[PDB]
């Protein structure tokens, strides 16, 4: 009858750094809206709930916001992938697929240290619609930037399964940003679901939920077409492993690994930490 | 590696209220432990407490994500609720939980969800009347326009942290969103933060000093919203009430509340208990 779940850190070589997550690793009695209510009881960015199945390496995943469900290939599930391998046990690399509704998610856990280094393989980004010379201008300013903030690279919606248009900015244009529009209709017209602001050089990035008002640490989701788009136009090596940085706005300044491969393929990988274990005392 | 737990405060359920993390025993954790630990479980506030002299007594530290914010509020109630679950007893259980330099009386009964607990803040203090100036200005620092107030004279009102309670409509109250730095203005009047009150429906809101993380359930401010409705004639005084709060956060919230004759203001709620939870890392 016990039901747990735990407290992690994801992109974390230490406890309390990273970005916080929960993991239900058994959320086979909840239904849509517990999940919902569970993830706005915990209050991490992101709460994720596992489903176990007749194969002990695979299991089905949910991945929710305090907003909304985002059923698409996250940090979450690096930090599923760590905790699967902590209950398993095991001194050797260990393999899981996680299932969301879109795609089925290969990653790979070994132990590092107090805690455990996961990995997983995005496949190809998708590369979408290019915003023309007027609606470039448009982000930049729902930023309180200006049109020469911007770089010199198009702006360009990337996806390996949530679309985020990537908003290439200057380093200094970065740490003034403030969301001060609505970004809704303006990111329909583009087929994309967040902004996400990308200082090239730097490789560095920054992003918020919808409203602008929390900053993500350390997003995985956009770690991967960061990754893509950064090796599309040359502005970083194909086949070897380089670093993203997030989350210094937030006093938890975060790594994230990435690499893009000959086939195309992303993989986002990063050090996890086990921070606490929670015994559900309520009723099923 | 010790031990916290996941309560919920002004919950008639579980999983709606304000959100709390209690340690109940922190003892061994410096302060820099304790902050950390807030802003890692990302709980409005978390709540530390530490032996007494007296089984009945504990000392309490309550951290935002921010600051320390030694008053009187929810915090105190998942606290009495979790020190009842621990301790064990049938009927009323009365706890003394100290924030500095004051004494608060708590009393807990278990309830057949959770636990029932009420907090006695003592006599409402008030404060600064803003001209008409200002209540517009810090009406439009919410994306409100003055015909927004609802004509009930905004007031500093504090039960130890002071609040200015700036009356709006209920439809003001849906729409409102910090677009102005408050500090400065906060300041010359003598309280730390806005609470945005409707009156008339007895539903309050409120953030953050940045206006950011909306707050579920205030049970700091509800002492004082209590006072100011009882000192306006919107509630009777003796008689307890309720205000809502959480709706913006799709979690509903009842505060019970009475200013008692004898000047004493209380603040009482349900309070669920969710979960234990153990460290894994020291």
Redesign the interface.
């Known amino acids: 009858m016990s039901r747990r779940?735990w407290?992690l850190?994801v992109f974390a070589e230490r406890?309390?750094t990273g970005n916080?997550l929960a993991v239900f690793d058994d959320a086979s009695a909840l239904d849509d809206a517990?999940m919902q209510?569970?993830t706005?009881?915990?209050?991490?960015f992101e709460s994720i709930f596992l489903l176990p199945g007749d194969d002990p390496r695979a299991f089905r995943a949910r991945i929710f916001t305090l907003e909304e469900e985002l059923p698409f290939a996250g940090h979450p599930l690096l930090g599923a992938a760590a905790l699967l391998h902590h209950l398993r046990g095991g001194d050797n690399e260990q393999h899981w697929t996680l299932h969301l509704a879109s795609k089925s998610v290969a990653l790979r856990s070994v132990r590092a240290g107090?805690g455990f280094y996961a990995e997983m393989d995005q496949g190809r980004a998708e590369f979408g619609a290019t915003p023309d010379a007027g609606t470039c201008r448009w982000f930049a300013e729902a930023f309180s930037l200006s049109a020469n903030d911007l770089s010199g690279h198009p702006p360009r919606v990337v996806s390996t399964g949530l679309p985020y248009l990537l908003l290439p900015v200057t380093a200094e244009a970065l740490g003034r940003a403030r969301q001060v529009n609505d970004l809704q209709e303006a990111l329909d017209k583009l087929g994309a679901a967040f902004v996400y602001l990308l200082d090239v050089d730097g490789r560095e990035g920054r992003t918020w939920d919808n409203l602008g008002?929390?900053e993500d640490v350390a997003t995985g989701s956009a770690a991967g077409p960061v990754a893509a788009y950064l090796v599309e136009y040359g502005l970083a090596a194909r086949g070897e492993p380089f670093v993203l940085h997030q989350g210094r706005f937030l006093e938890r300044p975060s790594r994230l690994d990435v690499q893009v491969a000959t086939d195309g393929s992303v993989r986002v990988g990063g050090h996890v930490?086990?921070?606490?274990?929670?015994?559900?005392?309520?009723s099923a």
Not at 40 to 44: F, T
Not at 273 to 281: G, I, N, S
Request: aromatic share 8%; hydrophobic share 50%.
């Open positions: 779940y407290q850190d406890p309390l916080g517990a209510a569970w706005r009881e915990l209050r991490q107090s008002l929390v930490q086990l921070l606490a274990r929670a015994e559900l005392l309520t």
